Paper text:
The main difference between low and high salt structures as well as between the two chains of high salt structure is tied to a flexible loop (Gly44-Ser51), containing enzymatically important Asp46. Together with Glu34, Asp46 forms a catalytic dyad for muramidase activity in i-type lysozymes.
In the low salt structure, the Gly44-Ser51 loop is bent outward with Asp46 exposed to the bulk solution. Surprisingly, all three amino acid residues in the isopeptidase site of destabilase do not form hydrogen bonds to each other in both high and low salt structures. We expect it is because both our structures were substrate-free.
Author numbering: 21 to 138
The structure:
Amino acid sequence: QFTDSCLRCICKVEGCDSQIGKCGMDVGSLSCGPYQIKKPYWIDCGKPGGGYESCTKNKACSETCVRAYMKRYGTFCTGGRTPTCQDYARIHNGGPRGCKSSATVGYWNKVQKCLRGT
Ligand SMILES: [Cl-]
Ligand SMILES: [Cl-]
């Protein structure tokens, strides 16, 4: 299962409480809030909340979205194998195929340093 420890370390790498109420475009598309959720991710997690900006600026609604996204795409990305936090963090960063993409390994390494207290 996608755990609170996994979620917390994804939050930390994305900016977490410092991004409550905030959106930005510096990553290359619009990303909002403590988990830096983009609009297609909010569509894919089931459009929780009052709207994209309303949900993803808010920590609790963002966590509803992330949890739904991991439940929906985790075993999709792994092809049926039980997912781990490595898979969940890599699909947060890279999309539903992210757990297989070399481009998300660096992101997992940052999450894993949080899980190790580095
Ligand atoms: Cl793991
Ligand atoms: Cl790469």
